[PDB]
Amino acid sequence: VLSPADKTNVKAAWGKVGAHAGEYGAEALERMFLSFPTTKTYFPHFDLSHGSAQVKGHGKKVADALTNAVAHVDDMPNALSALSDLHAHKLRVDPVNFKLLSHCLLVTLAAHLPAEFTPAVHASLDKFLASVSTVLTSKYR
Amino acid sequence: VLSPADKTNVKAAWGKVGAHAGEYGAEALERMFLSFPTTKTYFPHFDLSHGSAQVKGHGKKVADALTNAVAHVDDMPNALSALSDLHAHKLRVDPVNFKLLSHCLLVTLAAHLPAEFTPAVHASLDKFLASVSTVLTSKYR
Amino acid sequence: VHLTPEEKSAVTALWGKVNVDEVGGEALGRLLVVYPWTQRFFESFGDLSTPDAVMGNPKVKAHGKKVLGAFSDGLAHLDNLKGTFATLSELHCDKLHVDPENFRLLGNVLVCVLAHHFGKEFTPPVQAAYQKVVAGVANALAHKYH
Amino acid sequence: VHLTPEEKSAVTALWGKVNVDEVGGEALGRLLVVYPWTQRFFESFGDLSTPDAVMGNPKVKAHGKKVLGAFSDGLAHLDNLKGTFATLSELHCDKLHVDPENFRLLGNVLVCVLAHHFGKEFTPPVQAAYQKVVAGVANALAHKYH
Numbered sequence: 001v002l003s004p005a006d007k008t009n010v011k012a013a014w015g016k017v018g019a020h021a022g023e024y025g026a027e028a029l030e031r032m033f034l035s036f037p038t039t040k041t042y043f044p045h046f047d048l049s050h051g052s053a054q055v056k057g058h059g060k061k062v063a064d065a066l067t068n069a070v071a072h073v074d075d076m077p078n079a080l081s082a083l084s085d086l087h088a089h090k091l092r093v094d095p096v097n098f099k100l101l102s103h104c105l106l107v108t109l110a111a112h113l114p115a116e117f118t119p120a121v122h123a124s125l126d127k128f129l130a131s132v133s134t135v136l137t138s139k140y141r
Numbered sequence: 142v143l144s145p146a147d148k149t150n151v152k153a154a155w156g157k158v159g160a161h162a163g164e165y166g167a168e169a170l171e172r173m174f175l176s177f178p179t180t181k182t183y184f185p186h187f188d189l190s191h192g193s194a195q196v197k198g199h200g201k202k203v204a205d206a207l208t209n210a211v212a213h214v215d216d217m218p219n220a221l222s223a224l225s226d227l228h229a230h231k232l233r234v235d236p237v238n239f240k241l242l243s244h245c246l247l248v249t250l251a252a253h254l255p256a257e258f259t260p261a262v263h264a265s266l267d268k269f270l271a272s273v274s275t276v277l278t279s280k281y282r
Numbered sequence: 283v284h285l286t287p288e289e290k291s292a293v294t295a296l297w298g299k300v301n302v303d304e305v306g307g308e309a310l311g312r313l314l315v316v317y318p319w320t321q322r323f324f325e326s327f328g329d330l331s332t333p334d335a336v337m338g339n340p341k342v343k344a345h346g347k348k349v350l351g352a353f354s355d356g357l358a359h360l361d362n363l364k365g366t367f368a369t370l371s372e373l374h375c376d377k378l379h380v381d382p383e384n385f386r387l388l389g390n391v392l393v394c395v396l397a398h399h400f401g402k403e404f405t406p407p408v409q410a411a412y413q414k415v416v417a418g419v420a421n422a423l424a425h426k427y428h
Numbered sequence: 429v430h431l432t433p434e435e436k437s438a439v440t441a442l443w444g445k446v447n448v449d450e451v452g453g454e455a456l457g458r459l460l461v462v463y464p465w466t467q468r469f470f471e472s473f474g475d476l477s478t479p480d481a482v483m484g485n486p487k488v489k490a491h492g493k494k495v496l497g498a499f500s501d502g503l504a505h506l507d508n509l510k511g512t513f514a515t516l517s518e519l520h521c522d523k524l525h526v527d528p529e530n531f532r533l534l535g536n537v538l539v540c541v542l543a544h545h546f547g548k549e550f551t552p553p554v555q556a557a558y559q560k561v562v563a564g565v566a567n568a569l570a571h572k573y574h
């Protein structure tokens with residue numbers, strides 16, 4: 001649903017993230033793979049160690065998809081339809097995992113943006129990531 | 142998302158439920174309040190005993206809303222917008238509770254419709270109730 | 283899980299009646315069909331592209347039996363689910379990395395299956411009692427995470 | 429929860445640094461703001477219609493302190509979270525009827541708050557260690573359900 005305030009908030013905070021978006025993604029993936037070992041089950045082909053260039057390259061991929069969502073926030077289904085097919089319809093990704101990733105993303109953002117991660121932005125950002133997750137699991141329903 | 146098969150399935154199974162929809166709701170509420178005592182926290186004004194006429198009257202209310210969704214399955218947000226405001230925006234209903242109710246609904250339906258509750262219909266019916274829940278918690282996101 | 287004399291009565295009369303050859307395959311089959319992500323773990327089972335595929339798969343009905351037997355054990359030892367399930371928890375947690383939420387879901391599709399089999403016999407009190415048990419098994423399987 | 433020498437090291441150096449007067453109010457405030465359903469339990473706290481309302485509410489910062497203290501206890505007694513939390517579990521389960529999922533959410537907003545406070549110090553290894561702890565406290569609080 002994402003009210004007009006949330007959109008503004010998500011746009012602002014993503015703005016600050018700017019060119020670090022890819023470094024931010026790679027970090028979020030790292031916090032997830034460590035904190036939540038059960039997610040590593042989907043990435044048995046990766047080297048998931050601290051400096052893995054596969055985690056880096058994948059972090060940028062996650063960051064760009066999110067940047068695409070922000071830029072197309074009033075049309076996310078259309079924007080991400082293809083990544084839905086993939087995630088929901090081909091890799092068959094357990095939905096619970098999208099919460100764990102969104103959580104790690106929020107931790108990464110809190111760790112880097114101490115001025116912009118207010119209560120309100122945190123709330124917006126949580127809603128935004130909940131929507132992106134809904135679209136990604138959309139096949140499932 | 143609800144493919145064309147699911148819609149057909151939900152339409153069929155609801156059809157069978159026919160005039161029992163209200164008796165079915167009241168039963169689902171009963172199975173929930175017993176199985177999941179934590180949900181009773183939202184109904185401190187009810188008498189939740191086996192024959193409570195408040196549970197009956199509320200079961201019909203739940204059944205009708207669902208019947209409205211089925212009848213307007215390609216436009217549920219518009220159809221249920223008002224019940225979203227209520228559930229999400231005023232009673233502030235913990236989202237976890239919509240899963241527990243949908244589960245009890247599926248148990249009620251399995252208990253009464255042994256011919257039509259096949260694997261495929263069960264799958265459809267689960268997706269349908271997941272959508273209705275998404276719309277109801279829609280404020281939240 | 284605790285369970286009162288009458289809850290146990292309710293759980294134990296019904297379980298005695300259970301076809302332990304078929305229910306156990308229906309639950310697993312329906313788990314795969316309704317929650318397709320879980321299929322990842324059973325890709326060796328084969329032809330699973332449609333629900334009729336899944337429901338007729340001999341290895342599905344074969345493995346659902348193993349599952350039902352573990353439930354009968356927990357029923358045998360409600361007072362010690364943890365000790366009863368340790369070898370399984372280690373497997374599901376350490377080896378397989380199964381997210382414990384899927385233990386809950388299997389529990390709940392198991393409750394549907396019993397509703398479907400036993401119809402009005404599966405009243406709400408008998409449901410409430412089976413939800414406890416199901417939740418105790420899920421909690422026990424997940425212990426190694428805890 | 430288990431925790432290795434180095435995980436404990438990581439959890440314990442950081443916790444010593446924690447402002448136990450403020451963090452505890454930030455977590456609760458943010459819980460209410462981000463997951464508004466939880467406000468139902470705190471309607472006596474008063475003016476909570478906006479985030480600035482909530483964050484300045486003296487009873488919020490007052491109660492968040494009680495919460496932080498319970499976390500310090502679990503930290504003190506990781507080996508016995510259950511015994512440490514029984515009186516709280518009974519309260520939260522029997523009296524209040526709180527769905528255990530919200531224990532998880534408070535745990536996780538607590539982890540954000542520490543990330544927000546400590547920035548790069550809150551590296552991924554130090555996060556992974558705090559997720560264990562947080563999960564052990566949630567599991568312990570919910571015990572009376574189990």
Ligand code: HEM
Nearest residue numbers: 039042043061062065066083087091093097098101132136
């Ligand atoms: C916030 C949601 C997420 C976004 C934005 C996202 C984005 C992406 C993108 C952009 C790709 C590459 C696309 C391509 O190759 O065409 C990808 C691949 C993939 N994602 Fe995600 N993803 C997300 C969440 C998840 C989660 C929760 C997991 C599960 C642990 C996951 C598992 C996968 C897998 C296994 C692949 C293929 C990976 C590979 O081949 O290396 N994704 N994801």
Ligand code: HEM
Nearest residue numbers: 180183184202203206207224228232234238239242273277
């Ligand atoms: C499948 C989703 C559900 C449907 C279809 C539904 C439908 C309804 C309807 C039709 C009403 C009466 C509307 C009116 O008075 O204007 C209602 C009231 C209410 N519902 Fe739901 N509901 C659902 C799920 C939930 C859940 C999960 C709970 C939480 C335990 C809940 C809590 C409430 C509360 C407390 C009220 C007001 C009850 C009262 O005043 O007695 N609802 N619901």
Ligand code: HEM
Nearest residue numbers: 320323324348349352353370380384385388389419420423
């Ligand atoms: C309510 C909990 C469940 C119980 C009672 C349970 C019980 C069992 C039993 C008895 C075995 C047989 C192991 C043996 O032969 O010694 C097993 C294996 C297995 N289960 Fe579960 N299980 C449960 C849920 C799940 C779920 C949710 C999944 C994941 C979708 C899962 C995945 C598997 C897999 C793939 C194996 C094969 C292990 C192997 O052969 O290496 N189980 N389970």
Ligand code: HEM
Nearest residue numbers: 466469470494495498499516526530531534535565566569
């Ligand atoms: C991670 C778990 C959490 C911990 C560590 C925890 C700890 C505490 C503590 C220490 C008290 C003070 C009790 C006393 O004065 O003796 C308490 C009370 C309370 N908590 Fe929690 N709590 C947690 C999560 C929650 C959640 C998720 C909610 C629900 C939204 C909740 C609702 C309350 C309420 C309303 C009280 C008031 C009880 C009363 O005064 O009767 N708590 N909690």
